[PDB]
Amino acid sequence: PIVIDLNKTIERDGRKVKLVRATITVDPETNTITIDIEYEGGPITKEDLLEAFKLAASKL
Amino acid sequence: PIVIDLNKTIERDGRKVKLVRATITVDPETNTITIDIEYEGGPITKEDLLEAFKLAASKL
């Protein structure tokens, strides 16, 4: 269970999304990476989750 | 269902891992990003999956 601090905000389309943490779950047997993303902000969307998906990778 | 071409190889610790594709599944209702990673190469590990996890984010 890999944990990454983000501490970055995204104000996309008027939605405040202050990022908190990214909990990465890597499973080498199914070739799958699962990413839990905690944020303290307004309603999140699929476009915003890809942004925090970019940020989590840039921090490791 | 987002699909990203990778076409990059990783020879970490003597394991050839030629990357093929990354199938991203974003779920805004559980704050989870699921990543399927197809590769044509030797045995993959958790360290190698994080590398293709970095590459998939860098391509979008």
Residue numbers in the entry:
A (entry chain A), B (entry chain A): 9 to 68
What did the publication describing this PDB structure actually write?
The loss function guiding the search is computed by inputting N copies of the sequence into the AlphaFold2 (AF2) network, and combining structure prediction confidence metrics (pLDDT; per-residue structural accuracy, and pTM; an estimate of the TM-score) with a measure of cyclic symmetry (the standard deviation of the distances between the center of mass of adjacent protomers within the predicted structure).
To evaluate design accuracy we attempted crystallization of 19 designs and succeeded in solving crystal structures for seven (three C2s, two C3s and two C4s). All crystal structures had the correct oligomerization state and closely matched the design models (median Cα RMSD of 0.6 Å across all designs, with resolutions ranging from 1.8 to 3.4 Å). The side chain conformations in the crystal structures also closely match those of the design models. These two hallucinated structures are distinct from any structure in the PDB, with TM-scores to their best matches of 0.59 and 0.54 respectively.
